[PDB]
């Protein structure tokens, strides 16, 4: 508050034209150019992008992602949209909104959510621990097909509450505003949904001293991760702590609730498993041959 | 509602030709929204009060009103003398006169009923113009020709005359409703009657002579109010379906109709099924999508009685009716023999002049056996046939929850009482099982219900004494569900001596191990096992006669004791005292003496005779003699 | 309308003659003679029955159905679709065969009259 | 996307169910337009069955157009039948229904007021929502395969799918107001406002040619007479029991019941609900609705009663004829007793009583 929000609006005009050439050039061997022709036929939604790829080339904007994680989410919405429609435009017609995650390292900010001083505003924090409670899966409306049974016009309205993808500090109580002051209805014929599931993460109390209390922040899952966050399993999520604006009263005081927009949900003991190598082929066969009496003893 | 009348003529043209004669231009005026015209409905009702002759009217019920002469012509001198200017008009008389006027009153009683209130005043002024009362003469139509339910309410019956009979559980208090507004000026003295019709609140800002805004204060202490009694009523138990709970409709009563229908009676409710949108906020005019269904309350044959009298003279009516309650078991007729006399009980007498007003003449039968062997059909068959039967659970319900207890109610700001099950079946029969394993607290409250006939509950600052009484039956069970000849019948029954002494007769389901006993019982159930329904309505009478046989002697034949048949009760009481052997010198209380008189009144009630002879007295002691040998 | 299929358990696991037959199962007498057939699963030290118990389980490791003996397994829509067509059939017992059922009930009471420890 | 105009749709579907006889599934030219529609005008027929399978086998473009938009491609089917109602006037019988008595006198007055010279407001006329006296039922066509809510994706809604859920809890039937008739008490004029949303709009102003002269605000009165009522019903359903995978979560679904199906369905039975899936427009309540509140629900067209096995009220299903001789080729029974518990062996007399259990 309050000049940090105005500075983020200017960077939005330059952040949309940042990853447009990162996915079109042949600097990263050819991973993005080879997987683009396979995910369209499989009908997915998320693209596998490594974070370490944007550091070996030019180490300039590699640290700007940790200072403002909200501006980096808009670049993936315009880079992938102009990529699918330019290669295989036979399918990029029913879905006009996409989202890309990040896999890899995220600096040194992936610690316990405790260091919340005045130097971590509008940054990125991660809530690590053990998943306890899990909610249900509900289709979250992203790009609703606004239809009007009169003038027959299309409206592309986005929410503004720092909760969805592209949003601004305003309100989300179903406003009645419209570009032409026409009634709009959600047409589920060619709409875009999103599997929304909120889970809670609680750290283990084995490291609690004598004056500190653990925290519990909800984590929003993704779309291609259905039934991948069950209670009784540790994860590794990377979110961005934000706030929700409230219209209660004239001047907004210190009313800021807790929310976390996870950019990518990773599984360590479920989706990931210790893969074998050259040690689980030769050492196992030799252990059963040259044995002593019996290997059961 | 005050609706205007719109003429049905050609707009823009006065009269298109048509001279002298009136062709399609007569009295086409009618109320906008109703096919009933005031100028036409009034003329059709004046002839109904002068040219109506009902020769089929009785004389014992229509005392003071002539039969050959028009009935409504003699009622002109009856309204001005009763005090209240409200005439009671039956809807059945309207159908027998004009069929067109009868269909217009039920289809829309919102403007036809107020129309009748102005037609009677014109006839009343032409006979007794000097006799005046309070306000004006109003018409309260009742007794319709429709019998529907809450589930058969069609959407086309909105704002119509619907008559549905039911039972009123409880009523609300008194809610004053301000009708005509009353104001008083702060400078001068001037009264203003503002009609608050259609639920509207408005006050004039201009006075009479002062003519100053915000100078006429409101005074709600001299206007005319009206009590709003919220009366609840559900479907009648005689015509309710089995398998679902009945629906309760909220009834409203205003004017003199407040505190007229006592809670717990069967009064035919005649009202208008209206609907008003629920107002969520009394300030801002808001309309709820779910309306409130409210009803504004407005107010045997000779082909079957003669057949019941011919069977009373037959000496086999007592044996045929006793065998109809055994659809499977051939023997064991003495168990269900006393149940037939339980529905009759006897005529209740009053002795308030000697300090003993309340007195019950009902018979309480006590049973005992295996709950399932021969008592499975004697607990669910006396519930579907008898409409005054209420079934309840012993262990499933609480002790105070079965009767009338006290429960908090923050809605009315008063600790109101709640009903139960046996408190509603007055002058009938209650159904309740599990008496051997019932609650300990439930056994204590039964020391004054069927004994004192006055449920006095004075606890938690609630002084209330209920006067509900109903014959209650029981079905006990031994400690091992089997008779033990090694011990007496006293140790087998776990109930105390003060509990078993309050019952009249006593029976026990015995299963002898005799070989010839199965030859008369096992050969009967197999004979009717493969047979369908080709012999039930051929060798046994229908159930339509049993329900009509008890609904006639309970309010026509009042038997009483005499001087010869009453002397046998004294000699029979001394012989049954020195029993001994089993228990000893017992039965020295007026309990069995009072129950013996109830058996004689029940036997003479089935015979349709007020005079009790010595024949019915010998039959009363015979049933008590079989109860002694059964438990010994 | 439900068909009760009770799976009770004795007070000592297997069948052990400890006391009367009525007190062996913690259940009142109102539910003992209420059923139609009262079966019991016991165990006897016999190597003939135990030999077949260790044979059919061996074929389970190879085949997921019945062992290759003489019986064959069924599917699913066979025994239920055939038993559903006779639900509306109402058999009629003639007057000649009805006397045999009544005469058999008299002889059935002899085994319960001379032994009060079992069912009645 | 699906931005199609509605000014030309009414001129296309009208010539599909009027001047052309709809052929049945068996290829037989039924005279439904000259038998069922004749008794419809004579207050004898209540509801009429309109099978959507006859349109998919003849005009596949009309069925596929519902998937793109269902705001008008699903309600105009009853409008074409209403236009043929005045043309099917043969004999003149007196009105027996008490509801239609106070309707013929108010419509004749409007004919004497709309003379060529002074036309009144079009809102005071009866369109195609009040003059209709029938409720058509639409079965499941061939646009979507009838499946359960679990296997059907969330993006497949809004078209024309079939839900075979299970009713769990119902409510009280309340007559829903269709055409809210108003009456201005400041000039003596009326105002007809037909509404379809469950919310009610308390209109105060009277947009008429006479109320404009007052210039002070009209006072409308909600007249319950001279309108139309429909048996509205609200219930909550759940997914089918024998149509779930391995581990799932329950999901509620709102299904509206109107017409002849009201006061028949009971909680516990299995039904197959088919129709569209479109949101509602909550505009009227100035207390509950704060901003927009564009809730979405499912609209039902035809409900078919099912059970457990097959799609009919029965405890179990039946087979054919060639499959009966396979089970009835023994003396009595010997392969069914061994089929019980094929993993264990022992006590064959106990397994015999298990088969003789459901018979009773």
UniProtKB/Swiss-Prot annotation, chain A:
The modification Phosphoserine is found at residues 160, 275. One of its GO terms (cellular component) is nucleoplasm. One of its GO terms (biological process) is regulation of DNA-templated DNA replication initiation. Its main location: nucleus. Acetylated by MCM3AP. O-glycosylated (O-GlcNAcylated), in a cell cycle-dependent manner. Acts as a component of the MCM2-7 complex (MCM complex) which is the replicative helicase essential for 'once per cell cycle' DNA replication initiation and elongation in eukaryotic cells. Core component of CDC45-MCM-GINS (CMG) helicase, the molecular machine that unwinds template DNA during replication, and around which the replisome is built. Component of the MCM2-7 complex. The complex forms a toroidal hexameric ring with the proposed subunit order MCM2-MCM6-MCM4-MCM7-MCM3-MCM5. Component of the CMG helicase complex, a hexameric ring of related MCM2-7 subunits stabilized by CDC45 and the tetrameric GINS complex. Associated with the replication-specific DNA polymerase alpha. Interacts with MCMBP. Interacts with ANKRD17. Interacts with MCM3AP isoform MCM3AP; this interaction leads to MCM3 acetylation. This is DNA replication licensing factor MCM3. The gene is MCM3.
UniProtKB/Swiss-Prot annotation, chain B:
Its EC number is 3.6.4.12. The gene is MCM4. The modification Phosphoserine is found at residues 10, 21, 24. Belongs to the MCM family. Early fractionation of eukaryotic MCM proteins yielded a variety of dimeric, trimeric and tetrameric complexes with unclear biological significance. Specifically a MCM467 subcomplex is shown to have in vitro helicase activity which is inhibited by the MCM2 subunit. The MCM2-7 hexamer is the proposed physiological active complex. It comes from Homo sapiens (Human). A motif (Arginine finger) lies at residues 501-504. It catalyses: ATP + H2O = ADP + phosphate + H(+). ATP 1 binds at residues 356, 502, 591, 594. One of its GO terms (molecular function) is single-stranded DNA binding. Acts as a component of the MCM2-7 complex (MCM complex) which is the replicative helicase essential for 'once per cell cycle' DNA replication initiation and elongation in eukaryotic cells. Core component of CDC45-MCM-GINS (CMG) helicase, the molecular machine that unwinds template DNA during replication, and around which the replisome is built. The chain holds residues 122 to 773 of 863 of the full protein. This is DNA replication licensing factor MCM4.
From Swiss-Prot, chain D:
ATP 1 binds at residue 345. GO terms for cellular component: chromatin; chromosome, telomeric region; CMG complex; MCM complex; membrane; nucleoplasm; nucleus. The modification N-acetylalanine is found at residue 2. It is found in: Nucleus; Chromosome. GO terms for molecular function: ATP binding; ATP hydrolysis activity; DNA helicase activity; single-stranded DNA binding. There is a cross-link at residues 15, 28 (Glycyl lysine isopeptide (Lys-Gly) (interchain with G-Cter in SUMO2)). This is DNA replication licensing factor MCM7. It comes from Homo sapiens.
